[PDB]
Design a binder for these strands. Structure first.
Lengths: 83, 96, 106, 92, 96, 82, 104, 95
DNA sequence: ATCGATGTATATATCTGACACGTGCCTGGAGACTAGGGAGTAATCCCCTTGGCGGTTAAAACGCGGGGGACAGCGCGTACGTGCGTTTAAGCGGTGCTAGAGCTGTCTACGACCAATTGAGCGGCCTCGGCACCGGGATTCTGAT
DNA sequence: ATCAGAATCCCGGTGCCGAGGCCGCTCAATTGGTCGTAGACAGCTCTAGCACCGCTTAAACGCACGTACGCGCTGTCCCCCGCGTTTTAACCGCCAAGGGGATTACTCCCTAGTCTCCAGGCACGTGTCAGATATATACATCGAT
């Protein structure tokens, strides 16, 4: 299958819960589109780096170490999955 | 017995600040990751732990962004966060 | 047979393994004798500090098992380690319970 | 597949001999140790490269520790490192 | 006659944005640098180019900080920049 | 020995710095905060430069030491060597 | 006869190969790695100098000064992204005034 | 003898702009920029070779590092320029 | 003040799976000997950093008037939070199968190393033209009318 | 719209000093040969990722409604700007000194490399107890009066 419209899968209550963890008390209605766009950009960057690492490794499965190295490359170091 | 519009929101703020669990349902996030990765290379495969790490990083980044948005909304003597607040927060963080 | 280099230095972390990692990590053409001992001592001190703060955090929460939440509390509560690990994300760590003053009632 | 895990357990029991530690926390501790080791080693290698030296000794590691670690942590780590090096030199 | 209280400020803004010279007098900055270095090691000496590099870095950092302060002031529907604006600009940039 | 040299950064200099940054109007309390920010940033950079100098067993701070310290701080300076 | 002429480049292939051997990057180094690296460096230098020359021409000058490099880098989005954290000595800042400060 | 790229940056400038000059401070800036990019690419390729348990830096590692470091248009053009140079070099060096 | 709703904390019991201990093995770390070269140390030189004097002028400090911008108060209306019934898909558990990660074996191309050659690149010297400084007219732009 | 004055732009002249070119030299890149080894490729295993079905139920969703907050407007007053006057110290140049940074030469001891061995640490296995869940419950807090 080819995917098309799964960015709407990040529902409004999910954004509301993420904002509640961040301390936001009251939310305006245009925030959701901006948050989805920010999510799209960040995931595209990280997925580009991880896919580049995988293609260099001659593999076809994105190993968690590839994602960890991709996060480390941009300075968003992540602990708990190796490396 | 309707509560005033502050008090339930603060209860949720306390609940999710004492919690640790992932806030985004897993399958839609997996589908979004697949859709995004489809462009760079076809017929890819993903380990489950890789998607878990992706989701952890996304949730942490979005929580930090929302904290900064809240701070810059408080700066304007407001409580509601608007799109301009997110734009300013990203502009000051040094994101594009 | 004879004593491990950690016992000679009086440390718990493996001096020899750190020496092998320094040799194989492509850092320099030569490696001094005291460099692995010094690095092992520093790593042991940092690990001991993190575990002390995590154990204190776990005792505060009345728990007897250190979990990532206690690591996040220990790191984000201490200013030195927060400067050291300011760009580090901890899986399953949560966030500090901080609420803005203006959002409080009254 | 080597990891710091057993050594962390020994240090934990040496410090608080009544608390366990979850597997996720073990992975986090191992990753933190590896990250600090990598930072210190890279800084020491660059430092030795600037001065046209071809060996990593105690002095470059001390200077790298002073560089990465914040002031209180740097002072305490330096003190412990010099104590361990002195003990090893006396014992050899 | 007098210009209105906007106009001379705008002229200065254009003039100093068009030029590339250093804005801080060299001897005061030199003395400040030597005082600050006095706390870490006594009887230190400085090459002129080292102090010039320090001065260039300070100019760039302060200029960027004032730009961010101007944006976060304009966010609050203000022209004038207050201490709280600089505090917010430094807090969002991860310097506090 | 030295006394109070953070006043050497006079008010007109901070005004000119804000003019390059595009600031049109400045409150009277900005200057002390700017001086504090300057004192902390210069403290960090000078600490790292003096550390690099002390490693080489030198007594003079060279431009290369400052450039290396700045590169370590994540802000890279071009045109002064290295 | 030189490796740069053989590859059709002006940058020194041999010097880059020596620097890669002395930099402690790997125990062995392939033959085409220095050629690839010098080609990439030559392309980047050509792009930066072309933009700087255009900026200097727009200023009616024939010499390239740090101001021209600064303008060329900040006026190109990709190079600005590549050199976001880099500060250029004697470069100045982009002419940019917020519309809110402009008069009636 | 102190080495730098300054005498090569001038040849490229005279090739792309036959009549434009350039000061000494711009030489220092361009030399610093070339050295910085060289060190970034080399360090990234070294880490890349270390991840895959290899001990050789080849054109593959340098190409992947270029793809990682440069923004998309620059990465594509640099990859094209590097692969063209490498294919021209291997075309000639035995024939 | 106050009590009812209500979510949240607290105390206890079953389980369960996840953590704490034992075992066998094998491979990575320790002792020993060798060479050799890298680093420590000592002398030298010169250049480049520090210190002082003087003037002078441009920049900083100070006083003062005022205007315009920050800020507090008020009204309003609308956008967002809360609750409830519905529906939708996320989650979990089992089962399938096959693609592909991972390990091992083999061998040949390829890169380290070493000695001889020489020509490309760097340091130094010289000069002239681009740019900067000065000066003066032209044009723009701002504010009061 | 107008007009005067202040600021800027432009145009030309003179100078000056730094960029461009030329030449000697030296040491670093090239070439040719040898030898070890590493990684490219084939092949085998067996793990786990993907796809699906079914049931359940909790989360999402749509809508109704009320009200708290963002935003626009108005008045006020205070405090920052802009300009004239006074002061001061930054800067340039010039000279003197000395000290320390870079260089070279000598030495010696410290580390890579190889070998031999053996014990510690790490998969596999196991068992048992702290915490998760469930349930009951207590308690403090929000809200309406």
């Amino acid at each position: 299958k080819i995917l098309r419209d799964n960015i709407q899968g990040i529902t409004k209550p999910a954004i509301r819960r993420l904002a509640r963890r961040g301390g936001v008390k009251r939310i305006s209605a245009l925030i959701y589109e901006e948050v989805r766009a920010v999510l799209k950009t960040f995931l595209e960057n990280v997925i580009r780096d991880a896919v580049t690492y995988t293609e260099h490794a001659k593999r076809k499965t994105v190993t968690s170490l590839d994602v960890v190295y991709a996060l480390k490359r941009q300075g968003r170091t992540l602990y708990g999955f190796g490396g | 017995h309707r509560y005033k519009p502050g008090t339930v929101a603060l209860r949720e703020i306390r609940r999710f600040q004492k919690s640790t669990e992932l806030l985004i349902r897993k399958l839609p996030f997996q589908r979004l990751v697949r859709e995004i990765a489809q462009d760079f290379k076809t017929d890819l495969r993903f380990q489950s732990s890789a998607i878990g790490a992706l989701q952890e990083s996304v949730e942490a980044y979005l929580v930090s962004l929302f904290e900064d948005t809240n701070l810059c909304a408080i700066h304007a003597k407001r409580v509601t966060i608007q799109k301009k607040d997110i734009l300013l927060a990203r502009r000051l963080r040094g994101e594009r | 047979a004879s004593t491990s280099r950690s016992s000679k230095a009086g440390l718990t972390f493996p001096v020899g393994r750190v020496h092998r990692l320094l040799r194989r990590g492509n850092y320099a053409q030569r490696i001094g004798s005291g460099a692995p001992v010094y690095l092992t001592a520093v790593l042991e001190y940092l690990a001991a500090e993190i575990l002390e703060l995590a154990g204190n955090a776990a005792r505060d929460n009345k728990k007897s098992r250190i979990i990532p939440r206690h690591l996040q509390l220990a790191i984000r509560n201490d200013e030195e380690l927060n400067k050291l690990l300011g760009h580090v994300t901890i899986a399953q760590g949560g966030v500090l319970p901080n609420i803005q003053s203006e959002l409080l009632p009254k | 597949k080597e990891s710091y895990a057993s050594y962390i357990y020994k240090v934990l029991k040496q410090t608080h001999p009544d608390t366990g530690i979850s597997q996720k926390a073990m992975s986090i501790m191992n990753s933190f140790v590896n990250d600090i080791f990598e930072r210190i080693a890279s800084e020491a290698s660059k430092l030795a490269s600037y001065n046209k030296k071809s060996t990593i000794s105690a002095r470059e590691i001390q200077t790298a520790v002073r560089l990465i670690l914040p002031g209180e942590l740097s002072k305490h780590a330096v003190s412990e490192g010099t104590r361990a090096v002195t003990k090893y030199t006396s014992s050899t």
